[PDB]
DNA sequence: TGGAGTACAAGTGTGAGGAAAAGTAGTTGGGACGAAAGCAGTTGAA
């Protein structure tokens, strides 16, 4: 349930985000050439946005000049399936080089259908399996205001290698 | 009182997946104790 302090990575997750952010670069360019009639591939993505670094989300005052008139002309299904088609053409040949469940992912996440499999569950590393165990027992006693026990879990969690700042300072 | 079609399992090739700790990929930090004198051949113009 609770967040874990692991620097966990797998090839199926390194691909499935890269399989996603490779695609998004093409469909972003395609949206602006139809707006013109009217290469890490993820390092290239975040150059469109400013990472907030103070808050989670870049919140912004509103009663100011950051306002806009509402755009009138809206989407339809006929324009959406023709603006995605040419990015869906070029994507299909790297879709057969990637693994089929990464390929099952991008087929599923492009029609809606967010993933229901959370990444810290199938990792099965036996050391992360205790790091997932301890942090769900760490928060559970802090939830239950049991402090001599949640001390003991927290003293044991910081000694297991690979744990982060996340557990460290927050519940001081 | 033999044959026509046919799902359940015994049984056989193709690649595709899984993982880690080593190495390498771009930004930023950082490296470079001296304001002395009367005097003389040349040399100023008268």
């Amino acid at each position: 349930m609770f967040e874990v302090p692991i620097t966990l990575t797998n090839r199926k997750f390194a691909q499935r985000r890269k399989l996603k952010y490779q695609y998004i670069n093409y469909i972003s360019r395609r949206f602006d050439r139809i707006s013109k009639k009217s290469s890490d591939e993820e390092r290239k993505f975040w150059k469109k946005y400013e990472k907030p670094e103070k808050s989670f989300e870049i919140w912004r005052t509103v009663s100011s000049q950051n306002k806009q008139p509402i755009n009138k002309q809206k989407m339809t299904y006929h324009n959406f399936k023709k603006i995605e088609k040419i990015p869906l053409r070029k994507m299909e040949i790297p879709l057969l080089h990637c693994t089929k469940e990464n390929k099952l992912y991008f087929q599923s996440i492009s029609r809606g259908l967010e993933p229901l499999k959370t990444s810290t569950s199938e990792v099965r590393n036996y050391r992360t399996r205790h790091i997932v165990t301890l942090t769900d027992l760490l928060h559970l006693n802090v939830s239950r205001h049991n402090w001599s026990l949640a001390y003991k879990i927290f003293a044991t969690l910081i000694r297991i290698p690979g744990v982060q700042i996340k557990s460290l300072w927050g519940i001081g």
Side-chain angles (χ1 to χ4, degrees):
Chain A
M1 174 162 63
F2 300 102
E3 190 178 1
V4 291
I6 318 164
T7 309
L8 56 89
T9 182
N10 295 318
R11 296 290 180 268
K12 63 183 182 295
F13 300 113
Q15 285 179 354
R16 76 181 69 190
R17 65 174 66 92
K18 184 188 286 185
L19 184 65
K20 182 174 86 272
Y21 289 106
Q22 179 186 1
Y23 177 76
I24 288 173
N25 292 316
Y26 296 114
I27 198 167
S28 178
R29 292 179 185 266
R30 180 69 182 176
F31 183 75
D32 291 332
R33 64 182 287 167
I34 307 300
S35 178
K36 190 167 72 72
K37 76 190 291 182
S38 67
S39 176
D40 184 73
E41 296 293 327
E42 189 172 359
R43 292 179 61 188
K44 188 175 73 175
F45 176 71
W46 296 104
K47 294 182 178 179
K48 198 186 291 184
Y49 296 102
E50 318 311 351
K51 288 177 182 181
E53 203 263 331
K54 301 290 290 293
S55 65
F56 296 97
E57 302 160 354
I58 179 162
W59 291 87
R60 20 166 95 96
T61 190
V62 35
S63 65
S64 294
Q65 301 309 349
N66 302 115
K67 72 177 185 304
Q68 190 66 39
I70 300 104
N71 50 1
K72 293 179 67 65
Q73 302 294 320
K74 63 181 177 292
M75 291 294 290
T76 191
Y77 181 75
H78 294 86
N79 292 122
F80 174 62
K81 71 185 296 296
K82 69 183 288 293
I83 199 167
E84 71 180 4
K85 181 168 69 176
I86 162 169
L88 284 168
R89 289 193 299 122
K90 189 178 281 187
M91 205 68 207
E92 74 179 0
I93 171 161
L95 281 174
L96 58 91
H97 292 90
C98 70
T99 67
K100 60 181 69 66
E101 61 184 0
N102 297 119
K103 182 252 190 68
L104 190 145
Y105 183 76
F106 178 73
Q107 285 180 350
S108 181
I109 64 168
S110 179
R111 61 172 64 90
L113 290 179
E114 293 180 354
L116 187 59
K117 188 72 170 179
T118 306
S119 300
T120 68
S121 179
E122 66 271 21
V123 67
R124 71 177 67 251
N125 200 10
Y126 174 76
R127 188 176 63 193
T128 66
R129 289 292 97 200
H130 291 89
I131 297 168
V132 174
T133 299
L134 286 176
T135 61
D136 291 331
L137 292 171
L138 177 62
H139 299 87
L140 190 65
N141 291 309
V142 179
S143 170
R144 291 168 188 169
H145 297 89
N146 190 1
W147 303 107
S148 70
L149 177 60
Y151 180 77
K152 293 181 188 294
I153 296 168
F154 188 73
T156 53
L157 180 64
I158 58 176
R159 286 176 169 85
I160 297 170
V163 299
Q164 295 294 110
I165 308 170
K166 290 181 182 181
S167 70
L168 273 171
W169 82 272
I171 39 106

